[PDB]
């Protein structure tokens, strides 16, 4: 099963946003092997921000 296959326009826009935030200065521990838990984390913090 797949909840996020990372190709749709708004998820790829979010992908491009955090790739740019990587490429600006620095972030924490690396990438290229993602996790759906991190996507749920991002969406839950977005839920809290909208709330």
């Amino acid at each position, epitope marked *: 099963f797949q909840l996020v296959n990372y190709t749709d326009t708004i998820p*790829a*826009r979010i*992908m*491009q*946003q*955090w*790739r*740019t935030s990587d*490429s*600006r*200065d*620095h972030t924490r*521990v690396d990438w*290229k092997r993602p996790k759906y838990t991190s996507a749920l984390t991002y969406d839950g913090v977005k839920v809290m921000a909208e709330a």
Partner: single-chain antibody
Amino acid sequence: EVKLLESGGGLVQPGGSLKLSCAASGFDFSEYWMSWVRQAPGKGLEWIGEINPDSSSIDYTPSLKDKIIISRDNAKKTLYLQLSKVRSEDTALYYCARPRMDYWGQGTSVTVNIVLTQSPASLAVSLGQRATISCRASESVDSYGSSFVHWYQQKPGQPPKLLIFLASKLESGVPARFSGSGSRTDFTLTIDPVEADDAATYYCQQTNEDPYTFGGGTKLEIKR
């Protein structure tokens, strides 16, 4: 502004120890990560390692782990590199750099698949002109719409300053004399106007996936 100064370099005997310091000024070293990268004389660069601000995870290359130690001091804002049992391959120019706000320090000299091809190898351009340097990648370097490729210029005795970042943005401090463009297999850096101080070796490096490769080096000649 951001300033990094390396010290402790020079000459060292084979088999001994060596400690190089790198002081920072103008920024906060207690939040920004640091990195160290080596460069052989006449060859490409080689990333030695990276270290975080809290000194909790210091990463390095898998082939140079038994002879390199990276530490930092946030109170003094100074990084430290310790080498033990130096060999003939240790005669190189090391360079401490910020988290690549990408800025690289001067470094110190110690004397004891993605393929990026530059085009051309050497060219001579007059003053006040516009030069073009192309770069071809063997694999796709495009990820999430942004091309994560940096263009730097290193001179003889000078370190490679990060000129162009992400193939579409100019770095702070450098004037509006270098632009970048391209698409997904071919990158192109343009210089307009051409000054006499820009006579150095240009290098395009992409760090999209493993391994982080570097460019072949394209020297720029100023006509007279």
